[PDB]
Amino acid sequence: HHHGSDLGKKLLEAARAGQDDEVRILMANGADVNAVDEYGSTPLHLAALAGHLEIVEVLLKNGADVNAYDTRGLTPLHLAALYGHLEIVEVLLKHGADVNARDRYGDTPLHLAAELGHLEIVEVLLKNGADVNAQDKFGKTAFDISIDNGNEDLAEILQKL
Numbered sequence: 001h002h003h004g005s006d007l008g009k010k011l012l013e014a015a016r017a018g019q020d021d022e023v024r025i026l027m028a029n030g031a032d033v034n035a036v037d038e039y040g041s042t043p044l045h046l047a048a049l050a051g052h053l054e055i056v057e058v059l060l061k062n063g064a065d066v067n068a069y070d071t072r073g074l075t076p077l078h079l080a081a082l083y084g085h086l087e088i089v090e091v092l093l094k095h096g097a098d099v100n101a102r103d104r105y106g107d108t109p110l111h112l113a114a115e116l117g118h119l120e121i122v123e124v125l126l127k128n129g130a131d132v133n134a135q136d137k138f139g140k141t142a143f144d145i146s147i148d149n150g151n152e153d154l155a156e157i158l159q160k161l
């Protein structure tokens with residue numbers, strides 16, 4: 001629907017604020033599920049960041065792009081991992097999220113979850129095919145990040161799971 005309309009902007013705002021009723025109302029009025037703001041963020045990026053599981057589900061049910069990339073190359077999965085939202089991480093993977101998507105720095109969701117010490121998110125990403133050898137632009141793997149941060153608990157999950 002159009003290109004950067006105020007209707008799409010209202011849906012982006014309601015998705016970030018977790019306004020479930022307002023999100024259903026706006027969608028019924030024809031708001032585009034894949035509306036983008038100036039940062040290339042979609043309603044699914046903003047709901048995943050702010051940890052609104054229910055809204056993430058309705059967006060997906062109504063055809064939101066699970067692998068949309070913003071201006072920094074961050075996908076909704078990168079954001080759910082970075083903000084520590086485990087249930088959203090699981091729901092996104094079930095709806096075909098690309099476990100090895102790369103942002104502008106070559107970091108995958110695994111790199112971001114390791115950097116923030118999110119152990120269970122790391123474990124879930126590994127069992128969904130996360131690439132342990134993926135190197136970012138600084139030449140680091142998620143394992144290298146865990147070692148540099150002296151998180152031996154995380155490093156052990158990264159080597160054995």
Ligand SMILES: [Cl-]
Binds near residue numbers: 051053085088
């Ligand atoms: Cl969650």
